[PDB]
CSV table of C-alpha atoms in Angstrom, one decimal:
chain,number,residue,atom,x,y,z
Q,12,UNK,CA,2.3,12.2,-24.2
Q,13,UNK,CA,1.8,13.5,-20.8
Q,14,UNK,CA,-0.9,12.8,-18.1
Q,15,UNK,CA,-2.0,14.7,-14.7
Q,16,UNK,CA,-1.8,11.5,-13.3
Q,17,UNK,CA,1.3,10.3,-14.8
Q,18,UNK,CA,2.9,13.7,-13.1
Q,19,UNK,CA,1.6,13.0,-9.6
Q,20,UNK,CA,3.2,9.5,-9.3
Q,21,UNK,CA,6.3,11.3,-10.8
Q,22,UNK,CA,6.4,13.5,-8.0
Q,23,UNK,CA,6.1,10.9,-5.4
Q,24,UNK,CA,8.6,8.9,-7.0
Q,25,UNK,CA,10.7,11.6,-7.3
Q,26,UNK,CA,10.7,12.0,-3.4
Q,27,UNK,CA,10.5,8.1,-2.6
Q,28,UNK,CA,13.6,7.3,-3.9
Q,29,UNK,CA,14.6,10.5,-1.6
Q,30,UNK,CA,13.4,9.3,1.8
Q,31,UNK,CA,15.1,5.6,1.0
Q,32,UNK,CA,18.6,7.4,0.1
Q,33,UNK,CA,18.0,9.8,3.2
Q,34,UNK,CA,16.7,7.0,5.6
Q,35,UNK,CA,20.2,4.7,5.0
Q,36,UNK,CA,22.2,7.6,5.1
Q,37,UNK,CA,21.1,7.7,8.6
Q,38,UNK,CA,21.3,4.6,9.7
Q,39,UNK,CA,24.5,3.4,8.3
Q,40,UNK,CA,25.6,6.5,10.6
Q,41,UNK,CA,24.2,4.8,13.6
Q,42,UNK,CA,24.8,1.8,13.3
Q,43,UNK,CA,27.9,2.1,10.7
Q,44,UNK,CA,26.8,-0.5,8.3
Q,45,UNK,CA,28.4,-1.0,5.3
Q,46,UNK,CA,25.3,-1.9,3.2
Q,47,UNK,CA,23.4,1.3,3.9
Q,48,UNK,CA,26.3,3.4,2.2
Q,49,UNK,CA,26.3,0.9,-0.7
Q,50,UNK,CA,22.6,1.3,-1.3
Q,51,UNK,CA,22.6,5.2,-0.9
Q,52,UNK,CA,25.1,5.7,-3.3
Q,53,UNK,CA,22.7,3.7,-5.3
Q,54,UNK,CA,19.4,5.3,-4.2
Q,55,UNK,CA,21.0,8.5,-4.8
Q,56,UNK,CA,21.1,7.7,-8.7
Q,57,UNK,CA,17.3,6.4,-8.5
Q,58,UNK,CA,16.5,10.5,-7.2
Q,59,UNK,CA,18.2,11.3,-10.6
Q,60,UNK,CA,16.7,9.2,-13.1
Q,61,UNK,CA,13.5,11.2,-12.0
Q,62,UNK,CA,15.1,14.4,-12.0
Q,63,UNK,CA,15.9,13.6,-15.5
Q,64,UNK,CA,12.2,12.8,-16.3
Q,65,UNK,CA,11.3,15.9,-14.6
Q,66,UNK,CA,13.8,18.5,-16.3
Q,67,UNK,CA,12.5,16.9,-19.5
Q,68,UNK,CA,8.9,17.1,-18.9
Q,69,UNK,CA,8.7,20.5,-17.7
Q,70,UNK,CA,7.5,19.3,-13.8
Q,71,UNK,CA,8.4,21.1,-11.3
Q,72,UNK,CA,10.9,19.5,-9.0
Q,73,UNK,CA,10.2,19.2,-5.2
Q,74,UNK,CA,13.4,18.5,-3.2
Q,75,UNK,CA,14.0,22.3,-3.3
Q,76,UNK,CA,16.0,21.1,-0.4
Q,77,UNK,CA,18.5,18.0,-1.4
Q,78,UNK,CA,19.1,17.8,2.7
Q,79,UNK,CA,18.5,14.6,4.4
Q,80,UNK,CA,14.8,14.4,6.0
Q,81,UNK,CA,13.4,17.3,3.8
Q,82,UNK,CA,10.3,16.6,2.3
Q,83,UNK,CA,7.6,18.7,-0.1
Q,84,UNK,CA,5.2,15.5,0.9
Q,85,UNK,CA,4.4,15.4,4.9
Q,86,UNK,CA,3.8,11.5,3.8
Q,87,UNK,CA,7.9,11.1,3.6
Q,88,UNK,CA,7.9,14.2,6.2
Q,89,UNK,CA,6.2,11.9,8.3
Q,90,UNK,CA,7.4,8.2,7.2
Q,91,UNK,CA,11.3,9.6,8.2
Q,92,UNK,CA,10.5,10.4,11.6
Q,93,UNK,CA,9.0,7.0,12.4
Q,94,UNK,CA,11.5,4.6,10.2
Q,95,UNK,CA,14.8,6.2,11.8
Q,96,UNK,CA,13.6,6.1,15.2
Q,97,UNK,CA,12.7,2.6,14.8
Q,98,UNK,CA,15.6,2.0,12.6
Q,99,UNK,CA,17.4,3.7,16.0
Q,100,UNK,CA,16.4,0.9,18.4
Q,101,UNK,CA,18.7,-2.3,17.0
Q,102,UNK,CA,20.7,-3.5,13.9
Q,103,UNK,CA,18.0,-5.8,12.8
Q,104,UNK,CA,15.6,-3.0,13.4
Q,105,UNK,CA,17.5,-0.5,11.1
Q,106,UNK,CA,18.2,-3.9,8.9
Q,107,UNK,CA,14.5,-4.5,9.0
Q,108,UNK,CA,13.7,-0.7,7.9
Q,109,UNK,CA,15.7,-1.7,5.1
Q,110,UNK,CA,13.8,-4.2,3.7
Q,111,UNK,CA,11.1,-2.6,5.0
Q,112,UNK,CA,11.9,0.5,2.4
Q,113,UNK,CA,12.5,-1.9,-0.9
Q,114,UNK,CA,9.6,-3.5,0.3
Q,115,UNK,CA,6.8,-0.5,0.3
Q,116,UNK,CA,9.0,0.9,-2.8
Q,117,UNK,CA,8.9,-2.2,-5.2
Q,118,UNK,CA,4.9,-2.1,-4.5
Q,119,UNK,CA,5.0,1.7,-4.8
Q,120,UNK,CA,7.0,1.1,-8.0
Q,121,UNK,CA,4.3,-1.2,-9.3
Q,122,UNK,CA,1.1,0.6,-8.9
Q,123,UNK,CA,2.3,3.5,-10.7
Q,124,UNK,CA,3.9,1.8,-13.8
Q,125,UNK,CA,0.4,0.7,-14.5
Q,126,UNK,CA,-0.9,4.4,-14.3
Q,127,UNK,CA,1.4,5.2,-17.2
Q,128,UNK,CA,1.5,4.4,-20.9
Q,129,UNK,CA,4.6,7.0,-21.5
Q,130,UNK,CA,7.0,4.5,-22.4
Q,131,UNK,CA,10.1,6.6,-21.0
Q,132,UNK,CA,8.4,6.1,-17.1
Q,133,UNK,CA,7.6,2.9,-17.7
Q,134,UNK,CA,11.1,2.1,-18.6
Q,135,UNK,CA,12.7,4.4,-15.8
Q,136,UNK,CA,10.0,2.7,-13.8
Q,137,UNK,CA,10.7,-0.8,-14.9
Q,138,UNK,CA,14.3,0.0,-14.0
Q,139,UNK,CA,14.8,1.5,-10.0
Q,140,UNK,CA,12.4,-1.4,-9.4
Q,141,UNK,CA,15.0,-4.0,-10.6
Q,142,UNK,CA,17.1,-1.4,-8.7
Q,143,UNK,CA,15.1,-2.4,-5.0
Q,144,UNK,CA,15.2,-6.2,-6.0
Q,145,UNK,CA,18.4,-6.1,-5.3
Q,146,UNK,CA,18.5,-4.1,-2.5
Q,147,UNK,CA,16.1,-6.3,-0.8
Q,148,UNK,CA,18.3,-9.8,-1.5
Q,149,UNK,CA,20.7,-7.6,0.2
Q,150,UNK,CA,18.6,-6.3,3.4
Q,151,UNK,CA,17.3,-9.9,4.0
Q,152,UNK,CA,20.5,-11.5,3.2
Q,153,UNK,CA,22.3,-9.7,5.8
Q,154,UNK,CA,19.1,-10.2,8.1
Q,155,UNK,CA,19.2,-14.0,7.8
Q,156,UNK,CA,23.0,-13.6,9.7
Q,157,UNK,CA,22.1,-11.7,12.2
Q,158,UNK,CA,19.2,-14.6,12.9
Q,159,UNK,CA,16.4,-13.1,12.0
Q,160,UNK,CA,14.3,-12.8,8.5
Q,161,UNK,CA,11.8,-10.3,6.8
Q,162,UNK,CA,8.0,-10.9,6.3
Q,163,UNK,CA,7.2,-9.1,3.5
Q,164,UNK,CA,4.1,-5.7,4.0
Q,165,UNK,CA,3.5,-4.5,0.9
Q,166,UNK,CA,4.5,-6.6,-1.9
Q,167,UNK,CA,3.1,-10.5,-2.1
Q,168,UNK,CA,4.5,-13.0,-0.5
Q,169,UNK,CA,4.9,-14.5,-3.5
Q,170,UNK,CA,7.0,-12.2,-5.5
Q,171,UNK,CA,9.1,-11.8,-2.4
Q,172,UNK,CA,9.6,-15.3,-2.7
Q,173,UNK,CA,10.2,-15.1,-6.3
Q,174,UNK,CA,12.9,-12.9,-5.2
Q,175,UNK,CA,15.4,-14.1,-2.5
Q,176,UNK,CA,15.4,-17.1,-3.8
Q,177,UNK,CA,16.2,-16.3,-7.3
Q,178,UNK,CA,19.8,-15.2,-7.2
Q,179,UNK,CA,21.7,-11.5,-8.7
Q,180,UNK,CA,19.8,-9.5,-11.5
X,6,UNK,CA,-23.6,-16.5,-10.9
X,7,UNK,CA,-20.5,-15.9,-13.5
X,8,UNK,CA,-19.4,-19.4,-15.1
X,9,UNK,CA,-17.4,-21.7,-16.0
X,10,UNK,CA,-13.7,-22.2,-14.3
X,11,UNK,CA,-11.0,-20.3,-15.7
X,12,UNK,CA,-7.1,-20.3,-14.9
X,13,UNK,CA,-6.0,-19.4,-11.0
X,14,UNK,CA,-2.5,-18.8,-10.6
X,15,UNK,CA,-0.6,-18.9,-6.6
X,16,UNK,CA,-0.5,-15.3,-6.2
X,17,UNK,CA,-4.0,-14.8,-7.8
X,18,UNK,CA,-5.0,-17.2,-5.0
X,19,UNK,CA,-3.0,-15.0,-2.6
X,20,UNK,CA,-5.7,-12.3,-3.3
X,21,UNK,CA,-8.1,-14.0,-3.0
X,22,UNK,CA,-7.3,-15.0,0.6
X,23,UNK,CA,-5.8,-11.3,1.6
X,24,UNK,CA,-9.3,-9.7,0.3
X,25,UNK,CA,-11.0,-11.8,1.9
X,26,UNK,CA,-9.5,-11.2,5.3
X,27,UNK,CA,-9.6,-7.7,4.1
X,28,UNK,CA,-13.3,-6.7,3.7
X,29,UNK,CA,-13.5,-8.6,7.2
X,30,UNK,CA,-11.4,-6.3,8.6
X,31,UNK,CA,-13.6,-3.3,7.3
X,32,UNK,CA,-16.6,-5.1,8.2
X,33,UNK,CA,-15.2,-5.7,12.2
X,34,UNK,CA,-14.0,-2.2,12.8
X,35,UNK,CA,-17.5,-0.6,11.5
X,36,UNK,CA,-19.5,-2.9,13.7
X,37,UNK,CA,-17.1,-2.1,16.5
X,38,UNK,CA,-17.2,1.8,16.2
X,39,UNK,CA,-21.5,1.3,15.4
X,40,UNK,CA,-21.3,-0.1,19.2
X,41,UNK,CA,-18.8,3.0,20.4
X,42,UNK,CA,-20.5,6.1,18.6
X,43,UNK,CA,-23.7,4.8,17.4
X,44,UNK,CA,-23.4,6.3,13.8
X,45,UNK,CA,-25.9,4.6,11.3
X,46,UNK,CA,-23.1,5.0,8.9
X,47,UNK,CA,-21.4,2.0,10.6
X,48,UNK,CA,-24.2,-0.1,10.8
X,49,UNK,CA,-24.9,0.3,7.1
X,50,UNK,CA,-21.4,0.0,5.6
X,51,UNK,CA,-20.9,-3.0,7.9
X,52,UNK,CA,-23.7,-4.6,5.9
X,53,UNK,CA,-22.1,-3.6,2.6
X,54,UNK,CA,-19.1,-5.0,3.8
X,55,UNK,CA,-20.7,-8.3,4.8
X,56,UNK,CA,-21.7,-8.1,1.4
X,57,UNK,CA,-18.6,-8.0,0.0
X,58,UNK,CA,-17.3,-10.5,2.4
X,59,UNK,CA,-19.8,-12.9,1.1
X,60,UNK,CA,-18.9,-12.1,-2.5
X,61,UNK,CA,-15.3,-13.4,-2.4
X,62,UNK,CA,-16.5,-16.3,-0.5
X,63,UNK,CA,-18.3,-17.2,-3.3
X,64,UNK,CA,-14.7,-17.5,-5.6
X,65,UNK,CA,-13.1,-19.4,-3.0
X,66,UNK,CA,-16.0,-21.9,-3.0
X,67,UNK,CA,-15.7,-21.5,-6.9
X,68,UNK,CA,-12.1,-22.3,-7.3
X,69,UNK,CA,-11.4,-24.8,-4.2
X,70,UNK,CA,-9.4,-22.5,-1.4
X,71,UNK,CA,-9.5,-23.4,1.9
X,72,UNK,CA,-10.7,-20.2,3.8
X,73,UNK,CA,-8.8,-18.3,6.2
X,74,UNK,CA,-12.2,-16.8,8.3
X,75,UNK,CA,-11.8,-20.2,10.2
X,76,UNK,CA,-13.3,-18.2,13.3
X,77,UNK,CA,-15.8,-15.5,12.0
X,78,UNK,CA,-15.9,-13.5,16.2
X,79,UNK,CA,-14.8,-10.0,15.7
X,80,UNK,CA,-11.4,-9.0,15.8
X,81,UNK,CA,-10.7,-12.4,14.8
X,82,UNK,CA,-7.7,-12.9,11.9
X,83,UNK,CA,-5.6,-15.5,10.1
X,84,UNK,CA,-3.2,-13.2,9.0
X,85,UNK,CA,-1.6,-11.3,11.8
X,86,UNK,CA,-0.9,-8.1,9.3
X,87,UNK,CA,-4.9,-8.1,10.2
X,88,UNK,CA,-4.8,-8.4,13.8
X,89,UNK,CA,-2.4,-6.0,13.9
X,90,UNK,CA,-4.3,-3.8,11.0
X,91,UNK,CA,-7.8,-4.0,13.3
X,92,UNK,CA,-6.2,-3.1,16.8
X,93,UNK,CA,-4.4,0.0,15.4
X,94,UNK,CA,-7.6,1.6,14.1
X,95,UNK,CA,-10.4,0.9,16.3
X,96,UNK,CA,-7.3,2.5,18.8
X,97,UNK,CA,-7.3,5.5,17.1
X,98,UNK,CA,-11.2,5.5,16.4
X,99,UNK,CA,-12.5,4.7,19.8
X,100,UNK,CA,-11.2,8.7,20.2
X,101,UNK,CA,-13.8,10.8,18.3
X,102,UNK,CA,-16.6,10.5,16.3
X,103,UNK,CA,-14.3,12.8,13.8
X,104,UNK,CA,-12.0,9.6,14.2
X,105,UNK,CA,-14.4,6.7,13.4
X,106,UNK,CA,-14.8,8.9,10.6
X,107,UNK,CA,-11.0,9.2,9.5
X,108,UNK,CA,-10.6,5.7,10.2
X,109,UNK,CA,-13.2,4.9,8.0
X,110,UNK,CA,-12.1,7.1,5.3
X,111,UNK,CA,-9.0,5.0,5.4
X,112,UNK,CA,-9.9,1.4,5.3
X,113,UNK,CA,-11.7,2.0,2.0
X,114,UNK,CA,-8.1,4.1,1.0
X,115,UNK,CA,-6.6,1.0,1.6
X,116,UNK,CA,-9.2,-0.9,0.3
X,117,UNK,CA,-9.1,0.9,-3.4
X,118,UNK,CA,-5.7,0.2,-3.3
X,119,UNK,CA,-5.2,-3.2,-2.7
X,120,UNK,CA,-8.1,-3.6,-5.1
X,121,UNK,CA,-6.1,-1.8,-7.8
X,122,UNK,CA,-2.8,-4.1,-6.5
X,123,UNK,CA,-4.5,-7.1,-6.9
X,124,UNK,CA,-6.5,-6.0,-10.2
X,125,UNK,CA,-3.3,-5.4,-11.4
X,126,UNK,CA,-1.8,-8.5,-10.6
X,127,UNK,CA,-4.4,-10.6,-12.7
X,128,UNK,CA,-6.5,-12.0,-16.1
X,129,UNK,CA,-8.7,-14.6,-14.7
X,130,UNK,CA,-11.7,-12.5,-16.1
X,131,UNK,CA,-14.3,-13.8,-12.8
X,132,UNK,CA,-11.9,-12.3,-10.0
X,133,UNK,CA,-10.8,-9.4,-12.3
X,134,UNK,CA,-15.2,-8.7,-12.2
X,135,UNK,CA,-15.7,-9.3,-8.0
X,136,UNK,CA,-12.7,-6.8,-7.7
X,137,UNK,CA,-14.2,-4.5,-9.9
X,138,UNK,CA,-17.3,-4.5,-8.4
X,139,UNK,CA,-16.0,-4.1,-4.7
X,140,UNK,CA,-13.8,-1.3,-5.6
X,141,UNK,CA,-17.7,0.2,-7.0
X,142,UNK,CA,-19.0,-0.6,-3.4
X,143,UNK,CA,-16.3,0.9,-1.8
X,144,UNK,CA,-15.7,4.3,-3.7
X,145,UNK,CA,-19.1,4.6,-2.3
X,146,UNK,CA,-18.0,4.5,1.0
X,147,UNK,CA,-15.0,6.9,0.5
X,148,UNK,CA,-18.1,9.1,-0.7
X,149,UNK,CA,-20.2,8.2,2.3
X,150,UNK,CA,-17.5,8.9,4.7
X,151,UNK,CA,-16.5,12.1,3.7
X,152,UNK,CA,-19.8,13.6,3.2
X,153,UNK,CA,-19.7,12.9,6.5
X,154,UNK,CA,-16.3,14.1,7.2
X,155,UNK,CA,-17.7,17.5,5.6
X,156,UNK,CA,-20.7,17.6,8.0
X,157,UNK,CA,-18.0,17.6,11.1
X,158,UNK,CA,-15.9,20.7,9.6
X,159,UNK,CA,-13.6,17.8,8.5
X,160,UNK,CA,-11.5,16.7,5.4
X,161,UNK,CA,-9.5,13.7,4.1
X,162,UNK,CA,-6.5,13.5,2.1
X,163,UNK,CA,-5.5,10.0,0.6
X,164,UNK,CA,-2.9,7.8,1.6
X,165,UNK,CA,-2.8,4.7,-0.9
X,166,UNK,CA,-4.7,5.8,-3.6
X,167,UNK,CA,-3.7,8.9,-6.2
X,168,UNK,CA,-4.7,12.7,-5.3
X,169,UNK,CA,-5.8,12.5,-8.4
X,170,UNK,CA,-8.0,9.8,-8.3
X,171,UNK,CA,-9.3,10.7,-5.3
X,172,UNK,CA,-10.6,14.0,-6.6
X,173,UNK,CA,-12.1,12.2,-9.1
X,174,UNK,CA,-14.1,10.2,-7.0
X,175,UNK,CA,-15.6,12.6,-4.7
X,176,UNK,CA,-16.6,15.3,-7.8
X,177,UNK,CA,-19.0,12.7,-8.7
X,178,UNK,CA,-22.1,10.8,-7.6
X,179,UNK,CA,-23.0,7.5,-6.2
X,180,UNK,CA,-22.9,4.4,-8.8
């Protein structure tokens, strides 16, 4: 039940959840953060849910290097590079890239489970995005005690309000 | 003229307001780079874009929303993610002419792809019709754009919307 589309998005996805996993697993080096291991350990299961998808769809798998900051796409090639080093300047900065990550993923997350009728992906789909939900109530909840807060970039402002104020999922 | 008055939800009206700010944004950067480089490709897709700007106005007039274009100058935004948005890109286009021409290229990347987001996000058959219709106008200036890309030994690859949507629209002609 397969599209060309549906594969693409797939693809990315597969390598999304990859920069998120690879980004906190440099920051909570930096800055030592207990929340960055937490959601890697996490965002390394959302890479795997894929890799599932893909062994069972016959697609060929692009981390042919599992290595942090690896990327088949220059687009995560690229978005690495500037998120760490920006990450790299403060706590609320790398804080900041979190949220920044769920943020651009949730909305990521979104525009392809509409692509899709393959009710497998739209389930897996469905279900790392519940998975970024949570990581975001977590960036911005450490945010707000640090002083500071997240405007939201990609998703509305809307259902980012929707979700830190609705509570655990 | 689409009537009568259907249901409007908050983030529907959200839209609304974002695309609105949106096609300004295209609008101000073409006229700006028009004034730099003097490409007629500017000056006509700024008048599309006016167009389109007008379009939406005619939904928030429709539905009751006050405007954010409070100040219509150039450059000018509500929304800082605008500002922000406008200054980074006539930055980069003020370069080259090959530049203007990526930057180009990549509002109307964006622009497809809020479209789709926002599409997406709604059933009030009236907006579900304007968006439709401005994603039309603007595959046309992903089109435009890279023809001229082509005519400077240049490409584009996509940034917001699919590969393979992208393909799709340039492997066919103007609607």
């Amino acid at each position: 039940p397969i599209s060309e589309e549906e594969k693409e998005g797939l693809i990315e996805m597969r390598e999304e959840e990859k920069l998120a996993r690879d980004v906190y697993l440099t920051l909570y080096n930096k800055w030592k953060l207990q929340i960055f291991k937490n959601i890697a350990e996490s965002e390394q299961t959302h890479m795997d849910a894929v890799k599932y998808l893909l062994e069972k769809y016959n697609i060929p798998d692009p981390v042919k290097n599992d290595s942090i900051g690896v990327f088949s796409n220059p687009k995560f090639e690229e978005l690495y590079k500037k998120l760490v080093e920006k990450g790299d300047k403060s706590e609320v900065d790398a804080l900041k890239v979190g949220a920044t990550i769920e943020d651009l993923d949730i909305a990521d997350l979104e525009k392809w489970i509409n692509k899709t009728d393959n009710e497998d992906i739209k389930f897996v789909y469905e279900n790392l995005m519940k998975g970024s939900r949570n990581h975001m109530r977590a960036f911005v909840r450490m945010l707000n005690n640090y002083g500071s807060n997240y405007t939201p970039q990609y998703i509305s402002k809307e259902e980012y309000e929707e979700i830190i104020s609705s509570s655990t999922e």
